[PDB]
Amino acid sequence: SEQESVKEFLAKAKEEFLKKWESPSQNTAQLDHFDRIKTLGTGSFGRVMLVKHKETGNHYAMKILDKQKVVKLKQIEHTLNEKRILQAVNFPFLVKLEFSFKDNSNLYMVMEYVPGGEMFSHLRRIGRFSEPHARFYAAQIVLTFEYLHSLDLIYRDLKPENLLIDQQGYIQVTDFGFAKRVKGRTWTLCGTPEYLAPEIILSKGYNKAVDWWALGVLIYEMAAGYPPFFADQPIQIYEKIVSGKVRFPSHFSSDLKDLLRNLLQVDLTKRFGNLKNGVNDIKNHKWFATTDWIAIYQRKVEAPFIPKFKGPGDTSNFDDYEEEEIRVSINEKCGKEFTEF
């Protein structure tokens, strides 16, 4: 009965997603609708800026990509994936794409502004999270991956830098640059070094089990204060990941260690999330026995903390970044490549 309710939820959510996936929105705002305020954060492919919508006064977070740089870095298809997927999804813990558009030089994705900062900042400052607090965050990711995987979506960039804390203390996942809709296996070498599954490093084909491996890394880092595989250079990280060895802090509970060894299985055919019972092996594990999954989904569980808020447009929960102009050429660049954006 409870299980049937979940099946029905996912079936309807797939119907809703597929309508938008097959007929994406396009060209829903323009640049002069907004004033640009300051940079909130950066990634390998661009920057995200705080902007203010002139007519409404609402603040938003605008991701800006330079088309020529996307082409040079061979990220065309990945960027088309990001926008097509984001405009089609709807889940409590996924950031909302409000508008998208392009001009002669750049591509723009305007999201809801999530003011509480990256989980990363809070985690580094406090050192580590208690197990109850790590569990609160982890449950949101479990539900998010159940949703995404049911739509044939792999996420491929889980890390604290991409988990934003909202004004109710809940997570919003950002940056779908590596997200992809795939049935069966794929091969791209992508992600962040500390979070790569062995099968990615070893140039094997891989599937949604890489997201469950990354969940193991995330839970370990939240509860320990440091990742399970760390070094000064990526190559030394990769050697540790593939080794099959992992060491746990002495303070980790018995149930936490058991869950983490099941998520950090080097053989994907033995990894939790990828066995016959799928996500239910995780949701039914002893470490999650106190979790009320529907209450998490509905945002009714008390949060570990509420971020400080000093008014609309405040960015105190984010680092400062060097600012750079947004140039728009008089000539259209890369039109054919980005036709569908």
Binding site: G43, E118, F120, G191, T192
Partner: peptide, 18 residues
């Protein structure tokens, strides 16, 4: 300690995708 070794390492700031 493992914590001290992490904090003295070069990868304690924001990490970029490969």
């Amino acid at each position: 300690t493992t914590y001290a070794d992490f904090i003295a390492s070069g990868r304690t700031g924001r990490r970029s995708a490969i």
